[PDB]
Amino acid sequence: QPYDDSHCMERAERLIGEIKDMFNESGKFCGENAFERLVMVDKVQRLAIDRHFQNEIAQALDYVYRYWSDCSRDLNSAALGLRILRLNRYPVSSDVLRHFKGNDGQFLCPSAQSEEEKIGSILNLYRASLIAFPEENIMDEAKAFATTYLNQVLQNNNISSHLSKEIKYNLEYGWHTNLPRVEARNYMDIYGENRSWTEMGGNMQILNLAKLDFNIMQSVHRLELESILKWWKDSNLDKVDFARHRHVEYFALACAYCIDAKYYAYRRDFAKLCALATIVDDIYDTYGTIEEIKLFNEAVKMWDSSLPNSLPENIKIAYKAFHMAVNESAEAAKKTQGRDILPYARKVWEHYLIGLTKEAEWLANGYIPSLEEYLENGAPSSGYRVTMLQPTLTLDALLPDNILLEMDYPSRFNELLCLSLRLKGDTRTFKAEANRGELVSGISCYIKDHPGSSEEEALDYLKDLLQKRLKELDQEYLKPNNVPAISKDHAYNIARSYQLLYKERDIKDLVTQILLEPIPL
Numbered sequence: 001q002p003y004d005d006s007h008c009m010e011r012a013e014r015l016i017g018e019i020k021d022m023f024n025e026s027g028k029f030c031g032e033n034a035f036e037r038l039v040m041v042d043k044v045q046r047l048a049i050d051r052h053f054q055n056e057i058a059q060a061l062d063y064v065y066r067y068w069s070d071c072s073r074d075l076n077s078a079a080l081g082l083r084i085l086r087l088n089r090y091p092v093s094s095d096v097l098r099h100f101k102g103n104d105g106q107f108l109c110p111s112a113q114s115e116e117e118k119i120g121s122i123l124n125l126y127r128a129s130l131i132a133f134p135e136e137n138i139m140d141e142a143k144a145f146a147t148t149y150l151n152q153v154l155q156n157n158n159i160s161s162h163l164s165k166e167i168k169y170n171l172e173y174g175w176h177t178n179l180p181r182v183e184a185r186n187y188m189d190i191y192g193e194n195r196s197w198t199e200m201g202g203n204m205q206i207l208n209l210a211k212l213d214f215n216i217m218q219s220v221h222r223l224e225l226e227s228i229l230k231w232w233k234d235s236n237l238d239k240v241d242f243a244r245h246r247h248v249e250y251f252a253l254a255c256a257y258c259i260d261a262k263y264y265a266y267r268r269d270f271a272k273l274c275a276l277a278t279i280v281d282d283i284y285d286t287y288g289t290i291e292e293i294k295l296f297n298e299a300v301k302m303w304d305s306s307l308p309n310s311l312p313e314n315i316k317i318a319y320k321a322f323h324m325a326v327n328e329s330a331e332a333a334k335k336t337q338g339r340d341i342l343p344y345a346r347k348v349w350e351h352y353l354i355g356l357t358k359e360a361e362w363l364a365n366g367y368i369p370s371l372e373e374y375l376e377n378g379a380p381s382s383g384y385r386v387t388m389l390q391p392t393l394t395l396d397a398l399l400p401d402n403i404l405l406e407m408d409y410p411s412r413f414n415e416l417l418c419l420s421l422r423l424k425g426d427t428r429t430f431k432a433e434a435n436r437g438e439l440v441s442g443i444s445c446y447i448k449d450h451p452g453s454s455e456e457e458a459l460d461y462l463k464d465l466l467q468k469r470l471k472e473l474d475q476e477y478l479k480p481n482n483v484p485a486i487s488k489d490h491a492y493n494i495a496r497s498y499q500l501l502y503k504e505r506d507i508k509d510l511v512t513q514i515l516l517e518p519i520p521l
Contacts, residue, residue, distance in 0.1 A: 006216070008212055008215065008216055009212075009216055011208075011212060012209055012212040012213055012216060015205050015208055015209040015212065016052045016053075016209060018202075018205055019044070019052075019053065019202070019205055019206060019209060020053065020056055022040065022202050022205075023037075023040060023053065023056035023057075023059070023060060024056065026040060026060065027056075027059055027060065027063065032067045032070040032071070034063055034064045034067040034068075034070055034071035035064075035071050035077050037060035037061075037063055037064055038060065038061075038064045038071065038077070038080060038081055038084060039080075040060060041057050041060050041061060041064075041084055042080060042084060043191075043203070043206050044057070044206060045057075045084065046183055046184065046187045047184045047187055047188065047191075047206065047207070047209075047210035048180040048181045048183065048184030048210070048213075048214075048259070049184075049206075049209055049210050049213050051259065051260065052209075052213075057088075061084065061085060061088055061090065064081060064084075064085065065085060065090050065092075068081065068085070068092065072096045072099075074100075074109070074110050074121070075097075075100045075107055075108065075109050075110075075121045075122075075124075075125060076109070076117075076120055076121035076124050076125075078096045078097060078099070078100065078128075079097065079121070079124035079125045079127070079128035079142075080124045080128070081096075082094060082096060082097065082128045083124070083127055083128040083130075083131055086131055086478060087131060087478070089478055089480065089485065094128075094132070094133070094136045094138055094139055095138070097125075097128070097138045097139075097142055098138050101138065101141065101142075105141050105144075105145060106145065107122070107125055107142065107145050107146070109121045109122070115158075116159075116160070116163060119150070119153050119159070119163060119167070122145075122146050122149045122150060122153075123146075123150065123166065123167065123170060125142050125145070125146045126142070126143065126146035126147065126150060126170060126171075127170060127175075128142065129142035129143035129146060130143065130174050130175040130176075131175060131474055131478075132471050132474070133471055133474060133475040134468065134471045134472055134475060147171070150167050150170075150171060151171070153167060154167055154168070160194075161193065162189075162190055162191075162193040162194045162197075165186075165189065165190050165193070166190045169186045169190065173186075173500075175496075176420075176470055176495075176496055176499045177496070177499040177500045177502075177503040178496060178499075178500060179253070179256035179257050179493060179496055179497055179500060180256060180257045180259075180493070181214070181255070181256040181257065181259070181514060182256055182500070182510070182513070182514070184210060184214065185214065185513050185514075185519065187210075188207065188210055188211060188214070188519055191203070191207055192207055208521075211519050211520075211521055212521075214518070214519050215518045215519060215521070217259050217261075218255075218514070218515065218518055219518075220261050221251070221255040221267070221514070221515060222515055222516070224251075224264055224267060224268065225248065225251055225515060227268060228247055228248070228251050228268060228271050228272070229248075231272065232245075232247055232275075235317075235320075235321035235324070235325075236317045236320075236321070237275075237279070237317070237318070237321055239313075239317070240279065240314055240317065240318055241314060242279070242282050242283075242286070242287055242314065243275070243278070243279045243282070243318075246274075246275055246278055247271050247272070247274075247275040248271075248511060248515075249501070249507060249510075249511055250270060250271045250274040250275060251267060251268075251270075251271035251515070252510060252511040252514045252515050253270075253497035253500070253501060253510075254266065254267040254270040254271060254391075254497070255267055255514050255515065256493075256497065256510075256514050257489075257490070257493040257496075257497070258270075258490060258493075262396065263394075263395060263396075265329075265332040265391070265394035266391045266392070266394050266395055266490065267391075269325075269328075269329040269332065269390055269391040269394055270387060270391040270494070272325045272329070273325060273326070273329060273386060273387055273390055273391060274383075274387040276318075276321060276322045276325055277352070277383040277386050277387055278383075279318050279322075280318070280322065280352075280353070280356070281356060281383060283296065283315055283318060284296075284353070284356040284357070284359075284360055285356070285359075285360070287314065287315070288315060290360075290364065292311060292312070292315060293357065293360065295307065295308065295311065296315070296319065296353070297353055297357060299319060300346070300349060300350060300353055301350065303323070303346060304323075305320070305323060306319070306320055306323075307319045307320075326342075326345060326346070326349060326390070327342065329345070329390040329391070329394065330342035330345045330390065332394045333345070333390060333393035333394050335394075336393070336394055336395065336396055336398075337393050337398065337399065338398065341390075341393055344389075344401070344404075345389070345390050345393075348385060348386055348389050348390070348408075348409075349386055351380045351385070351409070352380055352381070352383060352385065352386045354380065355377055355378070355379075355380035355381030355382075356381050358377050358381065359377065359378075359381050359440060362439070362440045363438075363439050363440055366439070367440070368439065368440060368444060368445060368448045369440065369445055369448075370445060370448060370449050371442070371445040371446050371448075371449050372449075373445075374440065374441075374442065374445040375419065375422065375423075375442070378418075378419075378422045378442075379414075379415055379418035379419060379422060380409075380418065381422075382418050382419075382421040382422040382425070383421070384414075384417055384418040384420075384421040384422075384494070384495070384498075385408070385409055385414060385417075385418060387494060388414075388417065388490075388491050388494045389408055391490070392407075392487050392490050392491055395486060395487060395490060396486075397484035397486050397487045398484070399483070399484070399487060403482050403483055403484075404483075406481050406482055406483050407483040407487055407488060407491060412472075412476050413473075413476050413477065413488070413491070414491075416469055416472055416473035416476055417473065417491060417492070417494070417495045419466075419469045419473075420466065420469060420470060420473055420495045420498070420499065421495065421498045422442070423442065423462055423465060423466035423469060424466060424498065424499055424502050425498075425502065426441060426442030426443065426462055427442070427459060427462050427463045427466060428502060429459075430505075431505075436455060442458075442462050443455055443458045443459060443462065444458075446458040446461055446462065473492075473495070477492045
């Protein structure tokens with residue numbers, strides 16, 4: 001070969017083998033070691049190295065599932081198993097937690113447990129409650145109780161430094177405003193600074209593989225970021241007065257869950273298509289008059305390679321970049337998907353523009369829709385779907401058209417994915433431009449439906465509706481069907497990356513963590 005494997009990577013591949021032997025020495029140990037096999041899954045999953053151990057993990061989780069009563073003996077293993085089995089699509093019930101709710105809605109830990117072990121149990125209780133399905137009250141009560149308990153634990157400063165870093169990370173990021181490698185980065189420090197944890201047999205090999213894998217794959221992403229920066233110069237987008245370097249942020253977002261080197265097209269196309277979606281949303285919402293938005297829709301209906309030369313320089317080259325990007329994305333998708341997907345692709349992009357046009361009509365005509373109408377059109381106008389479809393199609397997973405309908409529009413899955421983007425955006429208290437100063441908005445449509453409602457009552461409703469819709473989204477996402485799980489996982493992690501992105505808008509910190517700063521070894 002012209003390039004031999006780096007020494008970091010050889011070390012990592014060795015550790016992968018030693019850790020597989022750890023799974024298989026766990027499975028070869030007879031007797032219900034169910035909790036010991038679940039704890040190993042936990043470690044490799046929090047550290048976002050689970051892709052190297054998918055067989056070992058499925059075996060261990062099948063064991064954990066088969067002896068699920070033997071493994072819910074106390075609050076901590078009940079919660080730890082509830083979260084991991086549910087996220088890995090096993091059909092477990094949150095009922096197992098009602099067994100630990102006594103009077104006044106406290107949750108009980110084994111009394112033989114030390115104060116750090118009780119916080120361990122309440123931490124897993126907190127983390128389990130975050131993946132709630134609709135109409136599971138115990139999740140709401142578990143979250144309520146564990147938030148209070150963990151906050152009081154911090155207000156007492158009689159806590160080790162690593163346990164405190166774990167409580168604050170878990171309370172700050174939760175689940176929906178979070179991604180796999182963001183958790184991994186935090187747990188590398190949380191585990192690493194725990195002497196008793198790093199001394200347990202095999203734990204230092206897991207932490208070391210985690211650090212090696214973060215760094216090895218970060219240098220691939222960083223090599224790939226160079227093609228994105230080249231495209232931004234070549235596409236001439238760097239001349240568009242109304243486009244930020246958001247393309248690096250989006251690339252970083254994709255890298256925090258789409259990790260493998262083979263998936264370079266997913267990360268690139270997510271970065272490009274999501275940057276161009278923003279630029280389009282700016283052409284339609286602010287710049288561009290009614291005339292030019294019409295010619296844009298026209299060019300996209302016909303799929304012209306360019307615009308009419310008489311149009312502004314800003315928009316004419318925004319269009320050309322868009323046209324080239326959608327084409328190249330569709331091409332890579334043809335490579336894996338085994339079929340021509342540019343027809344399908346283009347129709348997705350028209351539905352996005354249809355949605356953006358409708359909102360500019362509303363603004364043009366002084367029209368204030370109802371919330372039901374606003375959220376119905378606000379799904380395609382959120383832009384969610386155009387940033388997810390084409391990149392997901394470039395993944396090695398085959399999605400025939402009659403499978404794609406279960407994941408894309410018009411499925412309940414895509415609708416809830418779009419709604420999360422839309423509602424999170426419409427509940428933002430700290431967007432610089434502010435939403436109080438726009439005619440059509442989730443806030444002002446709730447107030448047309450409820451005359452006399454303040455902007456406060458409205459915002460509370462939309463925040464709580466976002467919570468209801470995310471529980472439906474989690475249930476839909478984790479519901480068995482014919483879609484390959486890796487496709488659903490990427491679509492779902494696009495939605496989380498927007499929740500995260502809005503939370504951090506500190507966004508320079510995210511890109512640095514994921515892309516530019518390696519973790520000390």
